[PDB]
Design a protein around this ligand. Structure first.
Ligand SMILES: CC(=O)c1c(C)nc2ncnn2c1-c1cccc(F)c1
Lengths: 262, 99
């Protein structure tokens, strides 16, 4: 159930020194690829730098993303800005060991277009989607290259990563936990349960009061710069009552839920 | 459409005074992609700050991570200052060491 997904963005008026077009490539929750139109080269990220990949791998990623760069920038000329155009392209191995494609696009942050693999066509209801679709459909071999990218190149790459970088995906880093209270408005404190530097990202935080369910609290979640994760949940409680609470964390790195006290 | 950023400030490891660590400012849920982010030490801009690529979520909103190496002390206060077209003025979120 692992996805390989490219996040493509182009902007019609990039700020100086920033790229008109950039791509991040993701294997599940891990960024493995970076590309932008100023450097013009696809590069591995993080631990994927040390993946011992086939010789032509990164040159082929660069080739495909240079083609998509030209396609995205051509779309702006078809429109009647500023504009942002985004695409989410890739695949997932589904049940029965076949590939399931994703090919969606957004204009100024609204989904508006998709690629129909059965007809080999881009489509959508908006006139902007018709316009960009026709411009892309008119460019020679563009639909063919999009079909090859989704039906063949993406699952091939995904399988190459499961074969040479599966260790990256089997990383298990249990969270370091803190439970702390701070005074809030008069008569109240805020209790915060925080989970530091964990992987995979799936994690549950819950509060108990005298062993009884007290809710999930209000949760926040975010990455660290190594692709591990951070989470916190906070609960308003009456002041002086803080010591009747604890936090329970569940995470794939922990065989059992872990109770965290103040 | 426009979407205003959500701002989270937290350290990479649990904070211990005198121990080197990383301070993160994670900005997410925003659109368009142009955004300005500073980390602040007692209100002064921090110069040696790194950031992730600009990525986006399933709902097409953008996110990105700013981070810097630091050593927390008892008295030093840190914050993240964000400017974006959806904000009337720069938004400053203080680092709460418990978060
Ligand atoms: C550099 C960095 O912060 C980083 C790296 C290298 N790999 C990652 N994998 C999953 N998150 N993640 C992060 C990240 C990537 C993009 C946006 C963001 F907000 C965080």
């Amino acid at each position: 159930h692992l996805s390989l997904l490219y996040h493509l963005t182009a902007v019609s008026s990039p700020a100086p020194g920033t790229p008109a077009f950039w791509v991040s490539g993701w294997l599940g929750p891990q960024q493995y690829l970076s590309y932008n139109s100023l450097r013009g080269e696809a590069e591995p990220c993080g631990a994927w730098v040390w993946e011992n990949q086939v010789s032509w791998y990164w040159e082929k990623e660069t080739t495909d993303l240079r083609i998509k760069e030209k396609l995205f920038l051509e779309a702006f000329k078809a429109l009647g800005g500023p504009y942002t155009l985004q695409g989410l392209l890739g695949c997932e191995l589904g049940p029965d060991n076949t590939s399931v494609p994703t090919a969606k696009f957004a204009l100024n942050g609204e989904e508006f277009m998709n690629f129909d693999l059965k007809q080999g066509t881009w489509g959508g209801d908006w006139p902007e989607a018709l316009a960009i679709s026709q411009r892309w459909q008119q460019q020679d071999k563009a639909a063919n290259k999009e079909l090859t990218f989704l039906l063949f190149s993406c699952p091939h790459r995904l399988r190459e990563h499961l074969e040479r970088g599966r260790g990256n995906l089997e990383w298990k880093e249990p969270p370091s936990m803190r439970l702390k209270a701070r005074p809030s408005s008069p008569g109240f404190s805020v209790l915060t349960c925080s989970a530091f530097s964990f992987y995979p990202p799936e994690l549950q935080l819950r509060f108990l009061r005298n062993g009884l369910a007290a809710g999930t609290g209000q949760g926040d979640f975010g990455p660290n710069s190594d692709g591990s994760f951070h989470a916190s949940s906070s609960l308003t409680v009456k002041s002086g009552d803080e010591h009747h609470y604890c936090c329970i964390v569940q995470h794939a790195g922990l065989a059992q839920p872990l109770r965290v006290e103040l | 459409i426009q979407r205003t950023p959500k701002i989270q400030v937290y350290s990479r490891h649990p904070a211990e005074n005198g121990k080197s660590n990383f301070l993160n400012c994670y900005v997410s849920g925003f659109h368009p992609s142009d955004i300005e982010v500073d980390l602040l030490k007692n209100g002064e801009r921090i110069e040696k700050v790194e950031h992730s690529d600009l990525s986006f979520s399933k709902d097409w909103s953008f996110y990105l991570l700013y981070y810097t190496e630091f050593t927390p002390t008892e008295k030093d206060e840190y914050a993240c200052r964000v400017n974006h077209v959806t904000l009337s003025q720069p938004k400053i979120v203080k680092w709460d060491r418990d978060m």
